[PDB]
Amino acid sequence: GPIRKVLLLKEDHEGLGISITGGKEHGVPILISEIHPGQPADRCGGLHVGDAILAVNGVNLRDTKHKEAVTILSQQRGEIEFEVVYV
């Protein structure tokens, strides 16, 4: 599908509210496998199961290993930009 830019607002006591799978070592992108109800990703409205996360706050995640992506994603705070695509 089309590449999208999506804004997510997170408070400091929360996680992103997603589960991710995949990663470079598996030959696939960082993929959203869950959107947890009522948590920031669900609330932002623009992130969905099956979306590949291409970048977060300008950090490219297309060639990142699974745990690298976890560290990068969990570091982001507040108003967080995502670049995503559903394939």
């Binding site: 996680g15 589960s19 799978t21 990663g23 496998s33 869950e34 699974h66 745990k67 976890v70 994603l73």
Partner: peptide, 10 residues
């Protein structure tokens, strides 16, 4: 389902 890739809750 298959669980060959890791999943992380974040």
């Amino acid at each position: 389902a298959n669980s060959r890739w890791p999943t992380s809750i974040i």
